[model samples]
Target: FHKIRNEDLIFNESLGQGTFTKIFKGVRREVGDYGQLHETEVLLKVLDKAHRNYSESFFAAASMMSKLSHKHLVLNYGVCFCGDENILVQEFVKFGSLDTYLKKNKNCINILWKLEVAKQLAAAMHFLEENTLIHGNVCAKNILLIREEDRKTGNPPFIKLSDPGISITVLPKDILQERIPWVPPECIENPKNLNLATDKWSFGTTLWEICSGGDKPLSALDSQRKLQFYEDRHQLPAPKAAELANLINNCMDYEPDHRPSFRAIIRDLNSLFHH
Candidate 1:
């Protein structure tokens, strides 16, 4: 159909339903005399204006996204307010998301692909940590792969971390429920304290998934059994590779301070990539 005239008509066909908002593909159709019509693909995140939760959540997300900038992180173009709808416009990645891609491919990404994915994810996490922000939700589902042109020049396609809707500040009371398989021990045990340490645990679990070809961490156990396993610190089978296993374990350390910072994670990942 033609471009939507009403700003409220977010194109929902291309969008996906999320916990807090409905996402859509948006395009600009008009520009003022001094404003050049710059057409670019954007992911339109729509939240109900009347919903108090939506307002608070979107405000936090927008403020955080606007302040952060990195190649691996999704770019926020701007925010739009039309009557009762709050829309966040961001860069659209055509490659979909890592979670969906893995499922569609049946959990079999190539080794090279896995390494590249790890590099991007680690880089994104490092960038965010440098900015003193926690992704809060670091998972295979949230990472996006984008094609880059300079593969021959040793440059790889862009791998970006997307969907920061679940992110929270480094505060104790901001912790919330998480996906069972990927949730860290601290979060599972005490859902009240969330910090970089918890984020590191989640990141490690994601890394394990990447290294293991998207296998579920606690695939052998039922939901109840898995919860017990996590509580006991005996959740998933460890990665076979020493480096992979070490990295995962380090990030999943019981004590928050014991986990390596993103800086260290990036260094190790970079070494792995070069090696």
Candidate 2:
């Protein structure tokens, strides 16, 4: 990775806001090693020091993501520190998150499109596992998308997993409504227990959401107490589709050891997609 200058980027709009940082859509006017002064859309994640520990987490995330690469994973251009904050520059996805797509274009997104997404994500996760890495957070909101010409073909939007950082390196926090549903029971029991198993568990819940058309990951519960109740019982919501139900069951097994690896998940998705 290379260092970027903050003054070179122009922020247009705030993409989203989180606890410690805010994302913005921007354009870079500077040239890279190639001397290509191409101005293009990028996402700038501005991390604030609202809490004392955010800086450490930012550095950790930057180090972890710098050397990582996969077609289905978002590309990190580089990072630069601006004043009291660390700014992360990443490739822009034309479309938004998978959650946004499911909610806005459900009527147009066919089952095949959904299956392709599952397959691609499974492949990406498999790559991470092969490299002895884990995606700390895996959910619909963490996914970004882009629709572009296939070169050989026409338009097909591809999904890219983002924000697979800090889950393992950062400090834990209290249960938040936004994170509860997709979080695995083990993580819920103890946030520090995040690992490969928890990621698989989260994947199961994410798959369930996709199969059910953007329904809440934990679904059927409206309160944290009830969510804890369901977690204690290992009560995962049953998917309506027969094949999907079976896949979700295997992915969400009560025992983390019982969950399938990304490779196995990909194998199953391949069969499902072809069948």
Candidate 3:
């Protein structure tokens, strides 16, 4: 294993800090048997080693993301394990996170961008669902927009799902603090039993966020009240578009068995695009 020296890690002073981890724009110089001569641009996710949940979260993310291969999913190039310094190096999506963009360009959530975001997210979810994996956290904050270079007109932007820090194997957990209230009722209450169905619930909430102009689900309720609300009511606000509203309802259904599968979601989205 190659050890990263303290001097090799460079921080991007411009981007500042993020909510969960420090974001640093960096370049890893290829050396030794690694024959690649060009410098690799990467986003370094730096987390505190002493934090209680660090190891479990880090390993789970690294293990799953390292093996994943999908255009809509961000690629994990490699990891550096040197002493207490653990860092995840990944491909940097130039346009930054979906959350940042949404906040900056609030009006972009109109139909065109909404459909594109949905397609991107559906594609990523389809990949994970096909592999029997689940991205426990699927929100605008975790999605990154990538710009593709066009031969005729420079670069056009698209989306990719990123941030696997909260992803997990579909299973049950005793305590559910990591649960996002915006997620479907079944998942927020019983995270341990989470599966593709529960994931669909979360996806529905994400779609709501986009369609509702980034309005948070259950924003009117307190934390404790929100939990109780979801447990009892277990419903999402109706979407504005009739077809979209129907899809969200299906995805967020209280009964996991009733939720639409990723395959079904893809078919619906494809049809929506054609229509």
Candidate 4:
């Protein structure tokens, strides 16, 4: 809704590309107390000229999301529109999404930290429910984790989950198709008719991915077709991590109504972590 000056940000590197947006690692120079150029890192999600028509939705959605705050969610800096150009300013999260981070940091896994990550994300999901909104897309790739200094342990810390923004919901079919491992069968059967159930199913898959170190949860699917994936009537194979297998299985239950609420999921996760 507002304007972000193009000259204000210096693009550093390309993070990756979404269907209609190109995410970049950017830099903003700020003046300290002494007034010097201090480069600060940031992230930019901008619509390409060819896809500029989708600007209105991204701007409106991003501006709205900027108002909501949570420890686990990535905070939006602001939205900038200059003439025909639309740009979204997002906070920088090092190592990008969870899937990417897991690929690079295989040696860092701790069962306790993984459980903590799940608990934090469940809390994020609960927050979305309280706001009467749905993440719609909940998967490993959509989850971002940032490392911080843990004052208690004097070790690196990771806080997970990205801002579940609106633009992600309107992503192109091809782009959505790429995430099919985490997508529910009903969503593919009817494109825009998904509901919270769809998110539950997707999150269930994410649980498996998180446990498996970012492995695709259901390897039994020899094919990509909707029928092929759900051939066994939505009863998924057990997750590699036995401790949370039952919860993940419950989430991927055959019917939408059968899935556990975020509240219930959080309760069970807490119990597991406490035990």
**Candidate of highest lDDT:** 2
lDDT of 2 by residue, 1-275 (tens): 56887788888998778546788999987775679787878888887766547656665655675577778888888787755777888888887788777778753566677777778778888888887777767887777777722646755668888855445335454533446656666666666666777778778778777777776754556556656664567656575444577787788776888889888898888888600
Model 4 residue pairs with clashes: none
lDDT of 1: 0.67
Q: Model 4, 134-161: lDDT tens per residue? A: 5666788878878844659856456656
Stretches off by above 4 angstroms in model 2 are 32-34, 148-156, 168-172, 176-178, 219-223, 231-234, 240-242
Task: Write the number of the candidate with greater lDDT, choosing between 2 and 4.
Answer: 2
After superposition, which runs of candidate 1 have C-alpha atoms over 4 Å from their true positions? 1-14, 30-35, 106-109, 148-154, 167-178, 219-223, 239-243, 273-275
| Best candidate, TM-score | 2
Instruction: After superposing candidate 4 on the true structure, give the runs of residues whose Cα lies further than 4 Å from its correct spot.
Output: 30-38, 52-54, 148-156, 165-174, 218-223
Residues 1-275 of candidate 3 have per-residue lDDT tens digits of 13456556665644565434667888876563567565667788776677536545755665675577788888776677674656777788888877667667764545656776787798889888888776767777777888733438733457888756743333224224334554556656555566667678888888877676666667677667777776577676675544577777777777889878888887887887500
* Residue pairs in collision within model 2: none
What RMSD, rounded to one decimal, does every model reach? 5.5, 4.2, 5.0, 4.6
Which 10 consecutive residues of model 1 have the lowest summed lDDT?
169-178
Supply every candidate's count of residue pairs whose N, Cα or C atoms clash at under 3 angstroms. Answer: 1, 0, 4, 0
Ranking by TM-score: 2, 4, 3, 1
Sequence-dependent TM-score of model 3: 0.81
Which pairs clash inside model 1? Answer: 15-23
